[PDB]
Amino acid sequence: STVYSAKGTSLEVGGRAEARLSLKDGKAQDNSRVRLNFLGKAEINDSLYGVGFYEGEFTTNDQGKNASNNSLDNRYTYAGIGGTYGEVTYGKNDGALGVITDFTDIMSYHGNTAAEKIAVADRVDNMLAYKGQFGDLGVKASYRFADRNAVDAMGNVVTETNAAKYSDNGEDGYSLSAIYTFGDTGFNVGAGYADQDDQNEYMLAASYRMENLYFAGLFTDGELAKDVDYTGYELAAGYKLGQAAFTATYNNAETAKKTSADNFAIDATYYFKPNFRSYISYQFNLLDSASKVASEDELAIGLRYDF
Amino acid sequence: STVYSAKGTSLEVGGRAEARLSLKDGKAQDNSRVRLNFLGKAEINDSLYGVGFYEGEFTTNDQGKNASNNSLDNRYTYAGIGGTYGEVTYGKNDGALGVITDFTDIMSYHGNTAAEKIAVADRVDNMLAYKGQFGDLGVKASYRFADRNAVDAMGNVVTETNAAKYSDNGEDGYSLSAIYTFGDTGFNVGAGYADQDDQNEYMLAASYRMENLYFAGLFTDGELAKDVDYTGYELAAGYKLGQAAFTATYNNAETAKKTSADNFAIDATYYFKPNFRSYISYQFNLLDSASKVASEDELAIGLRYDF
Amino acid sequence: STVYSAKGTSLEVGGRAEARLSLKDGKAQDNSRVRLNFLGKAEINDSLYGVGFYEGEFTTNDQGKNASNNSLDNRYTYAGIGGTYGEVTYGKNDGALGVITDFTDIMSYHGNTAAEKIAVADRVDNMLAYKGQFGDLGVKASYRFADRNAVDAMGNVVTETNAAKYSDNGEDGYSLSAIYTFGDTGFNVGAGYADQDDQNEYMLAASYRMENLYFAGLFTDGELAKDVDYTGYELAAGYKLGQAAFTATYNNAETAKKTSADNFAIDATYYFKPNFRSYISYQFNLLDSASKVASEDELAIGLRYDF
């Protein structure tokens, strides 16, 4: 029953099977998903290595029939090289700000509703991505090229068979972030910045962990388009008791000077094993009459198996 | 060349590569397919475990060119928990009646043409599924929630950005089945029921196995819509001689009081190994002038490798 | 962390993660891709075996947003049987001429621009494929059935529910090739032929390898439609120095009596390990004013991890 890699010294296969039931106004939606991933690494010498990575996400939307479900999202497709000076990759990979949004994104299902990341800062293709650790300072960066297109003699996009010349879409950008870990103390701070076409943002964050408790704060500010502001605040707390972890978050965002998210959420997660867990979560959506839909609370129940 | 699971104690990778040539009126169609699956299990204690499962189906339809083939069907996406009282899952998984249709679904390619299962009884998402064994009695059940949707102030389906309130599609339902195995004797009986919106059905079945022979009967009856009956009958026989297994079935169904299927089929399957087999099969389609297409016989030839 | 095959004695998992940056007129396109493959083999006796194979290709096209990327191509889906007299498969697999085009297709990214293969000769479904080695002679062949369709009483394609009779698309064809290896000398010659509907072609090739050097020639000639000629020429050279391999090719094709490709290209590839390599490549496109687009040079940079 023995499984081998064709060419590598080794291959790590991972991902999840994650059953998720969402209840809003007593009505049920299946938000379940599978992820499959493949990680290969080639040691070159004891200070240099090559890496390759894929991850896909697979869902269903039957709507009451045994349908054919052709739903795939290639979340990551990259190769890279790393070693003494860090790691650099090309192809769809994470920008710089995810490690900052992680300060307050601690829940099983809810949270992360007021820390919007633009593409170059989040996860996107046609991008070089860098990371490295220098003592207690963790750094990330990315640079994204604008995407080549083909245009007619008037400059409109057409098929390469019938085009006059190449142009591009102006979607270049970059991101940067740093995190300082204060020795063994449990304290971290973080910051980052990103810029792409008419969008820019910065983030600042801090956190503390001590034994069975955790808390953290996050501030996000910038512009999602020309003269369209965005500002967001999140706070987070966590408590561990045996194999159970309980979390709460408060998230608040405004967009174009109007409240766009306002949510307090709490959950309980039970770890039967490190890779098998159940959870239940409730999000109080505190926007007023926002339409009724935009304001509905959410109950979520789940079971998560990690491969 | 060594392959590891990222987080699990173990991972089982399975599926098939199955070459299938279909001939009708001397004209060939490629019905070949690949299935890939991933099964993870986490032992919690010696009476409790967690489970996660994915399976996809992958085909081609070139029609004479070297085409790009984007054909995927996520057949199963689920997690569950089981142990002393049985197993329960959420996400796309089997309803109760497949283990009943299996009494007569014994051929490599043909058969199973007069035992139609509705969605909640077959395989569908937004569904809790249960199974367990109590002595010689095997039981299954499922319950399906209706699917949440979003509607305008007049109650028509629209995008959640522009909706007034949540509603649903009324596609709730349930299924149940039981199978009794009569000790070591080779005798089994089975029954089940399913109900969803305007559809309901029941099934009754029996089978006998003794050494190199097998035979079985199946009866299906109910409604596929309001005042639209469905009744189906199947009989099956099987004979094993060395590494070859030969099967024959007769299947007959009526729908809205008219004959909709009438097929006698026979095949031979040779097991070179437990996981590599060839087959040939012929289906006599006995409907009269039904159009010519609806009445054509089918010859099928195949080769099946299981991973 | 242990990974097993469900039913096989063993399973080989392979493929690649391949980062590729393409630059034309200073404008960047992400041509990166992942391939995943699964190869199973069942030994029957010491002169007979069964085989099953899948391979998929997975890409992204974000165009500056963190998009959902549903891009899959099932490149191979087949099962087969082989042993003393060779191997035969059915389902999407290679026709006969790829092993001939390989004489001059030696670069990491460029080359293979003037050796066009028709479907039955390239890779296509509804096809039997054969290969075998008889002393120093390597042979391949394939035969493709025309694809069944369903037509109305006037002979137009419609759904099988509403059709009168079955017809087909006339897309039958075959291919054949042979390669003679002259003992230990480093010399090979090759030839092949293919025919499908209104297309036919032949190929002739020769190559020499000696130590750190390689060179080769390829000639292709035939018709891509009724009274639409195609002729192509390629030359190739290769030099290895430590872990670096350098290649150059010249490719020239005419179609309907006009020059359709004219490219000289050169590259360098560094093998850090057998399964991890970087490359850089430049293609001089020598067509004149062809539109500007059709004539642009290409710089390509890459990193390739093989699983």
From Swiss-Prot, chains A, B, C:
Name by which UniProt lists this protein: Outer membrane protein U
Annotated GO biological process: monoatomic ion transport
GO cellular component, one term: pore complex
Source organism, top-level taxon: Bacteria
Described function: Forms pores that allow passive diffusion of small molecules across the outer membrane.
Family under the similarity heading: Belongs to the Gram-negative porin family.
InterPro entries noted in UniProt: Gram-neg_bact_OMP, Gram_neg_porin_domain, Porin_dom_sf
Originating organism: Vibrio cholerae serotype O1 (strain ATCC 39541 / Classical Ogawa 395 / O395)
Molecular function terms from GO: porin activity
Subcellular location: Cell outer membrane
Coiled coil (UniProt feature): none
Lineage, uppermost ranks: Bacteria, Pseudomonadati, Pseudomonadota, Gammaproteobacteria, Vibrionales
SUPFAM superfamilies: Porins (SSF56935)
Alphabetical keyword list: Cell outer membrane, Ion transport, Membrane, Porin, Signal, Transmembrane, Transmembrane beta strand, Transport
Subunit structure: Homotrimer.
Membrane topology category: Multi-pass membrane protein
